[PDB]
Amino acid sequence: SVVTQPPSASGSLGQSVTISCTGTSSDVGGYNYVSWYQQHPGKAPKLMIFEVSKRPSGVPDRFSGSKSGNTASLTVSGLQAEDEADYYCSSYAGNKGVFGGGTKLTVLGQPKANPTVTLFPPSSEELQANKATLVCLISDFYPGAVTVAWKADSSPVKAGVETTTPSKQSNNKYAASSYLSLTPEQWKSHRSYSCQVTHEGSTVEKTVAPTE
Amino acid sequence: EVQLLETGGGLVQPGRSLRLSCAASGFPFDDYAIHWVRLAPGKGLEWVSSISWDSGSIGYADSVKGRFTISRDNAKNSLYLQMNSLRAEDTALYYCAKGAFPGYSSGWYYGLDVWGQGATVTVSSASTKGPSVFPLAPSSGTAALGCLVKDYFPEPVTVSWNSGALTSGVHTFPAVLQSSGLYSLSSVVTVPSSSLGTQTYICNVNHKPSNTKVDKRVEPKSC
């Protein structure tokens, strides 16, 4: 069957957020066996609640469970940075289980994290293959919005730019990457190339040179 | 410690077959019921199948009923899932999970406390192109080095360092789907500077679609 869950939830640091989990009379509203799971990016799920409101060992008191009719709820008080994750509910349904759709929990209004930028020139092996790529890497930043700007010396680059979408890594922080594609002759034509990373009003710039 | 490890993933065409395995350790596999749960990209968790300790109780989801075949070998402490006639919607991340108590439905009663790392399964009829691997050399008290996994199709690629022994300081990044229709990826490790002439750093790129396995030694540039 289908267990309805809102796609996204949000709450500020220290506040509370309730994540609903709606089923029918044959699963959520038919038994007191609702479970809740937390999943950080890149890692296996973790059991947070079982039997509607029971907490295993290792789960803080901030997570609490409740149920009312066909709707089970997970409340997270005193929201913290590490609570940002995906949350799925589970329910028994008669020799079968069923999960909810899942809810992404964003913890709003936390201290920012400055990105660490690293720019790589084209390798000699790629240049020998008559290709050239500039690899700009951006990691350990929060929140996830970031603009990446490429520059040939001081002027903006014309074309050949590819940029990832910022996605959270295993440390629960965001990371992205941008690729500037050039011919070997374009690479050796300009004095320097720059990756400009704008994040939350602050701008970082890394620069490489074909001579240096 | 308790531990579950899934194996047997990869890309396979719609209609073909694929068998998954789950190796268990750290707990009495003889008595517990184990289950399969998958995570489809963009969707959430979805229960796949379940099997009791003696295989006396077996259940499947309606989407894979008469399609998958679950089994186990208690002597080898291994769980299996034979997936035949795979469809595009079968593309997911398959998890091996044990229950809190050895009963069949007890994993639903008290939750699934132990999960494996999962094995990726892709079901698409797409074409295949192997990646070119180039080293991102560092400048000879830390330094950043990596390698460039360029122009491959389709997803995904796995990048380890030093056959998996190098995990600390390894930075992970997502792939670009470039305007050419090909993906590109880069992996980077941060290491102390005083070890560039001492240690050896090798990135292990595995692109199973193309059967491409490259080991590239990344070493400092000679300016």
Author numbering:
A (entry chain L): 2 to 213
B (entry chain H): 1 to 140, 146 to 228
Publication passage describing the model:
S is the major surface glycoprotein on the SARS-CoV-2 virion and is involved in viral attachment to target cells via the interaction of cell-surface-expressed angiotensin-converting enzyme 2 (ACE2) with the receptor binding site, at the tip of the receptor binding domain (RBD), in the S1 fragment of S (Lan et al., 2020). Following attachment, cleavage of S releases S1, allowing a major conformational change in S2, exposing a hydrophobic loop that executes fusion of viral and host cell membranes, releasing the viral genome to initiate viral replication (Walls et al., 2017). In summary, we have presented a structure-function analysis of potent human antibodies induced by Omicron BA.1 breakthrough infection in SARS-CoV-2 vaccinated individuals.
We have determined structures for five mAbs within the neck/left shoulder cluster: Omi-2, -9, -12, −25, and −42. Some broadly neutralize all VoC, while others are sensitive to the mutations at residue 417 and 484 found in Beta and Gamma (explained for Omi-25 in Figure S4A).
